[PDB]
Design a protein around this motif. Structure first.
Motif, PDB file in Angstrom:
ATOM      1  N   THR A  36       0.824  -1.202   0.000  1.00 34.55           N
ATOM      2  CA  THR A  36       0.000   0.000   0.000  1.00 34.55           C
ATOM      3  C   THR A  36       0.862   1.258   0.000  1.00 34.55           C
ATOM      4  O   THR A  36       0.545   2.239  -0.673  1.00 34.55           O
ATOM      5  N   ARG A  37       1.954   1.221   0.757  1.00 33.23           N
ATOM      6  CA  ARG A  37       2.862   2.358   0.844  1.00 33.23           C
ATOM      7  C   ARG A  37       3.518   2.634  -0.505  1.00 33.23           C
ATOM      8  O   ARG A  37       3.451   3.749  -1.022  1.00 33.23           O
ATOM      9  N   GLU A  38       4.153   1.611  -1.070  1.00 31.83           N
ATOM     10  CA  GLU A  38       4.823   1.745  -2.358  1.00 31.83           C
ATOM     11  C   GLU A  38       3.888   2.360  -3.396  1.00 31.83           C
ATOM     12  O   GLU A  38       4.262   3.293  -4.106  1.00 31.83           O
ATOM     13  N   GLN A  39       2.671   1.830  -3.476  1.00 27.30           N
ATOM     14  CA  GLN A  39       1.684   2.326  -4.428  1.00 27.30           C
ATOM     15  C   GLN A  39       1.289   3.763  -4.103  1.00 27.30           C
ATOM     16  O   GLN A  39       1.432   4.659  -4.936  1.00 27.30           O
ATOM     17  N   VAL A  51       6.820   8.678   2.648  1.00 30.81           N
ATOM     18  CA  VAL A  51       5.464   8.351   3.071  1.00 30.81           C
ATOM     19  C   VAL A  51       5.447   7.818   4.500  1.00 30.81           C
ATOM     20  O   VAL A  51       4.686   8.295   5.340  1.00 30.81           O
ATOM     21  N   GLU A  52       6.293   6.827   4.766  1.00 34.45           N
ATOM     22  CA  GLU A  52       6.375   6.230   6.094  1.00 34.45           C
ATOM     23  C   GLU A  52       6.660   7.292   7.151  1.00 34.45           C
ATOM     24  O   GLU A  52       6.073   7.281   8.233  1.00 34.45           O
ATOM     25  N   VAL A  53       7.569   8.209   6.831  1.00 32.67           N
ATOM     26  CA  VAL A  53       7.932   9.279   7.752  1.00 32.67           C
ATOM     27  C   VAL A  53       6.704  10.065   8.195  1.00 32.67           C
ATOM     28  O   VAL A  53       6.406  10.150   9.386  1.00 32.67           O
ATOM     29  N   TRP A  54       5.996  10.638   7.229  1.00 30.25           N
ATOM     30  CA  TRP A  54       4.797  11.417   7.520  1.00 30.25           C
ATOM     31  C   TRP A  54       3.966  10.751   8.610  1.00 30.25           C
ATOM     32  O   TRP A  54       3.510  11.408   9.546  1.00 30.25           O
ATOM     33  N   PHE A  55       3.771   9.443   8.483  1.00 36.87           N
ATOM     34  CA  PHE A  55       2.992   8.687   9.459  1.00 36.87           C
ATOM     35  C   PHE A  55       3.570   8.853  10.861  1.00 36.87           C
ATOM     36  O   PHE A  55       2.846   9.142  11.814  1.00 36.87           O
TER      37      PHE A  55
END
Length: 70
Positions: A36-39, A51-55
């Motif tokens: 889901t992240r990659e996409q 993306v992961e960071v923002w979380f």
């Protein structure tokens, strides 16, 4: 690694669209899946890593504001 306590990560600005998706995912699931992240990344024109960071950032508040702490 586990927690960003030792190392430090800089923050970056995002567009309404980019934020929408991110918040739309973090809202449904705190911790998404590699797939889901990659996409999502490519979808919002961002890098999986970012993306992961923002979380991680969001969680910071979710706890600060919440009764979790204090």
């Amino acid at each position: 690694g586990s927690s960003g306590s030792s190392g430090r990560r800089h923050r970056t600005i995002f567009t309404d669209e980019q934020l929408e998706a991110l918040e739309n995912l973090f809202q449904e699931t705190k911790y998404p899946d590699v797939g889901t992240r990659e996409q999502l990344a490519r979808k919002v024109h961002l890098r999986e890593e970012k993306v992961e960071v923002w979380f991680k950032n969001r969680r910071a508040k979710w706890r600060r504001s919440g009764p979790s702490s204090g």
